[PDB]
Design a protein around this ligand. Structure first.
Ligand SMILES: [Zn+2]
Lengths: 956, 10
């Protein structure tokens, strides 16, 4: 075959991986990975072009990103604007893309039966995109709106500010996102034809020698091979040289600098950065990984430990950060407590002391060896990935590794290279440092403004005395290298499947104190388990005060176990512990082999917990900030929040929590934990490589520990109170209106409540949702350009359900609302006119979506945990509900629309949350006339004036 | 511990 330059050899895979692989290089220079998995419910492809923002023209910031939007909008094999995404939608698929500095990465998934159709529509993006003129004018708004969303986000502000304080002549300085000004307004003024410029960029850079493709389906390797060759050898090779950037964006003048910056949220952070050469080529020994592992360690003797003990910082991130071909960074980043902000010079001193300890001891092979072994285990035992993410990640790394080495390259670690370690470490020095501090205390004391985000800041040289006192960092006896990691798993046996192993979880214990659900894993056979526990207590959430105390206590506990648990996390054993509205959640995941040791430690600490005064004050203060900081979350996130507050029986607001928090004292917290712990019920799912007897053993010990140390006794059945959804009146329409004080965009969520969940009411709603899904995005966003964020779909809470739209926009919510209603009418007309073939396509897509099998253990646990915490316990739900779906008719869906959702439906139940932009006042399809809504004035008054739904009835 | 993409949809 003359279409294929080369077929690759064996692709090194994990032993536990049952998928089959073949790499190849097409004659046009495209790198390919084909993945055959004959069990997959969804097939997938991705293509990654090794070009991005770093190559935008200097006078059209954002071109490559914009180009990336435009490729979705028609090709002239498939000129119909939304052909691609309508096809995926009717065949259970989904798609997305991103632009980074050097890559533009596109990907989809689709039902395994429609790979070729999906793939051929996709391949056209790369042959002849339309860039239609009127679609260009529309979609620049989506881009602009995407920038708008980020403008007031602290992380983007910082990301761009770093760019703006390095070499302005360096392409690292470029603004990558684009916006209406850079894409349309400034180019019109300059006489630039943006259409030509998209085409020119695509023609110059979308070349086959810069592309990798990955394709995953049911087909054999040979068939997938034919498929790829068919669709992609047509791609032109323009022989583009790969952009390289050997000059570091930070030169001499950009070093030994201090930046003091004003954030939007009340946060205090120190960012420390050193410029470093590109380390990518050393991937085999990865000295950057090695140094990050040490500098960023969190266990005893670590730099964090000390800083945290001094009461300076709570969290720390260390290690190498990507730049581009030719440069990288090494960062050490911390949060600051109020003392920490006064002690920045000391924090940095300590950073250098720790570094100097590494210098003094030299590189440690035993450490490198432990990283190597741990990576080897993680790779032997890796979870099977979802196809979409997997094709995308892999398409990205085919640019970096020989075909044969791509599955292994980002895991396996090979030769210890003490010498490269010293070369990197030797770049980590005071003469080489950039310091940034972020804090509201610089408000009014800054003299510079970043040009794209408007970020307020100041820049100063670090004085020579400071650099010198840092260069003299002596050693500090509080810094030691990590001890050997004792959590490393060593028992990997898959216990054989028991005589009466069940396919769904079985209830193997049911006492007053515990309900215990158990299933031995019958699909994955990895030495791993998931242990999930819900602990109910009425005192977790009885009142704002208490709800604050539940939270604080769990934080303080995590803070206290952190040194010990970090090791465990490195060894693939982790946990999650948080307060809920019912009392506490605890989850331990990872290799089964040492789970009981960590589990036991957690329950032991939790029941015998002694609070550190200094810790308590620090964490309380961070939580206070965390509560105020909600004001700077996105308008659409505000709308979802207020709706949850409105529709739930009991819910404390951030204002209520914040008010009640000054009253939380050390002595009341100390009294709170015993009370919290004294009476409990525990519901549990243990799922994994574990046996009935071991499960009982695990549960017994959780109990015996609580019982022993906390004297815990069971709860009454009637004390086990789940909460209700507000029941909306037939034909009611309510609006709650609030303002976001930070973002100059508005948000809205509209909720059409339907009825209690049940087989039929579930599938009516889900099918309608399916039918309107891409039309909603296509109309409200693509056609009308209301905003970058446009979502629609089912809302499920507290046993009830309904259909929701969320949108964020520069347009006022009253307007968004008429548009949604207009769209609903367009949707109705569209269902009346659609063919039976089309309708069954939708049933079929929904069906595939719901039956798609879990690919890893924890996705299967999440399904069961869903059924448990919601107390519906319907483990065979997908089968029942899909059989039922298959029965539904167009006429049915219409009658349901007509009784529940249409504007003059007898049972319409509508609530809208309107969140006004910072700055706003207190052709198209025909919008219908709407009633005067009842304006909600007070959430409590609203909840009280209304009935409450029942709770849903359970199954097993 | 050991150590920015613009998307088409969220
Ligand atoms: Zn985008």
């Amino acid at each position: 075959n003359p279409a294929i330059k080369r077929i690759g050899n064996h692709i090194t895979k994990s032993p536990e991986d049952k998928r089959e692989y073949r790499g190849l290089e097409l004659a046009n220079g495209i790198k390919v990975l084909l993945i055959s998995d004959p069990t997959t419910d969804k097939s997938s492809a991705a293509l990654d072009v090794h070009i991005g923002s770093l190559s935008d023209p200097p006078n059209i910031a954002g071109l490559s990103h914009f180009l990336q939007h435009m490729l979705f909008l028609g090709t002239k094999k498939y000129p119909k604007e939304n052909e691609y995404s309508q096809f995926l939608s009717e065949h259970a698929g989904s798609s997305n893309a991103f632009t980074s500095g050097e890559h533009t990465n596109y990907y989809f998934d689709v039902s395994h039966e429609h790979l070729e159709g999906a793939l051929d529509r996709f391949a056209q993006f790369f042959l002849s995109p339309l860039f239609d003129e009127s679609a260009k004018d529309r979609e620049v708004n989506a881009v602009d709106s995407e920038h708008e969303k980020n403008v007031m986000n602290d992380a983007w502000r910082l990301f761009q500010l770093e760019k703006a304080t390095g070499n302005p002549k360096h392409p690292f300085s470029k603004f990558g996102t684009g916006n209406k000004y850079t894409l349309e307004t400034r180019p019109n003024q300059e006489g630039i034809d943006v259409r030509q410029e998209l085409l020119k960029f695509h023609s110059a850079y979308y070349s086959s020698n810069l592309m990798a493709v990955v394709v995953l389906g049911r087909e054999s390797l040979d068939d997938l091979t034919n498929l790829v060759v068919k669709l992609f050898s047509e791609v032109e090779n323009k022989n583009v040289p790969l952009p390289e950037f050997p000059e570091h964006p930070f030169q001499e003048e950009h070093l030994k600098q201090l930046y003091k910056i004003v954030p939007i949220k009340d946060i205090r952070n120190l960012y420390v950065t050193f410029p470093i050469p590109d380390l990518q080529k050393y991937y085999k020994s990865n000295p950057g990984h090695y140094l990050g592992h040490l500098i960023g360690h969190e266990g005893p003797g670590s730099l964090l430990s000390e800083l945290k003990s001094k009461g300076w910082v709570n969290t720390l991130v260390g290690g190498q950060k990507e730049g581009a071909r030719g440069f990288m960074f090494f960062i050490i980043n911390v949060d600051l407590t109020e003392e920490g902000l006064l002690h920045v010079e000391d924090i940095i001193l300590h950073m250098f002391q720790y570094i100097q300890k590494l210098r003094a001891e030299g590189p440690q092979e035993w450490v490198f060896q432990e990283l190597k072994d741990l990576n080897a285990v993680a790779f032997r035992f890796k979870d099977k990935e979802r196809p979409r993410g997997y094709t995308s990640k892999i398409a990205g790394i085919l640019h970096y590794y020989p075909l044969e080495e791509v599955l292994t390259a980002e895991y396996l670690l090979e030769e210890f290279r003490p010498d490269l370690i010293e070369m990197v470490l030797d770049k980590l020095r005071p003469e080489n440092v950039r310091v940034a501090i972020v804090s509201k205390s610089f408000e009014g004391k800054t003299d510079r403004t970043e040009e794209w985000y408007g970020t307020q800041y100041k820049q100063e040289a670090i004085p020579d005395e400071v650099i010198k006192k840092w260069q003299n960092a002596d050693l500090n006896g509080k810094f030691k290298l990590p001890t050997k990691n004792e959590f490393i798993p060593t028992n990997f046996e898959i216990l054989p499947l028991e005589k009466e192993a069940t396919p769904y979880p079985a209830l193997i214990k049911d006492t007053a104190m515990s309900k215990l659900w158990f299933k031995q894993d019958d699909k994955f056979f990895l030495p791993k388990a998931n242990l999930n526990f819900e602990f109910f207590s009425p005192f977790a959430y009885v009142d704002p005060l208490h709800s604050n105390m539940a939270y604080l206590y769990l934080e303080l506990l995590k803070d206290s176990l952190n040194e010990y648990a970090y090791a465990a996390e490195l060894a693939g054993l982790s946990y999650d512990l948080q307060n809920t509205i019912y009392g506490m959640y605890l989850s331990v995941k990872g290799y089964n082999d040492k789970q009981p040791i960590l589990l036991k430690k957690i329950i032991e600490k939790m029941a015998t917990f002694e609070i550190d005064e200094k810790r308590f004050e620090i964490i309380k203060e961070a939580y206070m900030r965390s509560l105020n900081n909600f004001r700077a979350e996105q308008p659409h996130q505000h709308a979802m929040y207020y709706l949850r507050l409105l529709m739930t029986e009991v819910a404390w607001t951030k204002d209520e929590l914040k008010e009640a928090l000054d009253d939380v004292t050390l002595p009341r917290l100390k009294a709170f934990i015993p009370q919290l712990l004294s009476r409990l019920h525990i519901e549990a799912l243990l799922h994994g490589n574990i046996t009935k007897q071991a499960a009982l053993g695990i549960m017994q010990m959780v109990e015996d520990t609580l019982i022993e140390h906390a004297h815990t006794k069971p709860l009454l059945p009637s004390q086990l109170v789940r909460y209700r959804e507000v029941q909306l009146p037939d034909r009611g329409w309510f609006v709650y209106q609030q303002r976001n004080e930070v973002h100059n965009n508005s948000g809205i969520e509209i909720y059409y409540q339907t009825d209690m969940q049940s087989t039929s009411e579930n599938m009516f709603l889900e099918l309608f949702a399916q039918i309107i899904s891409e039309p909603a995005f296509n109309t409200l966003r693509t056609k009308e350009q209301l905003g970058y964020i446009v979502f629609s779909g089912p809302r499920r809470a507290n046993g009830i359900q309904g259909l929701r739209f969320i949108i964020q926009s520069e347009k006022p919510p009253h307007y968004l609302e008429s548009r949604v209603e207009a769209f609903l009418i367009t949707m109705e007309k569209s269902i009346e006119d659609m063919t039976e073939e089309a309708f069954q396509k939708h049933i079929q897509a929904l069906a595939i979506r719901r039956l798609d099998k879990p690919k890893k253990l924890s996705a299967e646990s999440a399904k069961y945990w869903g059924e448990i915490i919601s107390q519906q316990y319907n483990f065979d739900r997908d089968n029942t509900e899909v059989a039922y779906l298959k029965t539904l008719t167009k006429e049915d869906i219409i009658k349901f629309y007509k009784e529940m959702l249409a504007v003059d439906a007898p049972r319409r139940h509508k609530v809208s949350v309107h969140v006004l932009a910072r700055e706003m006042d207190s052709n198209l399809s025909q919008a219908p006339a709407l009633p005067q809504p009842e304006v909600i004035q007070n959430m409590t008054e609203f909840k009280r004036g209304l009935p409450l739904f029942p709770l849903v009835k359970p199954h097993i | 511990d050991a150590e920015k993409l613009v998307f088409f949809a969220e």
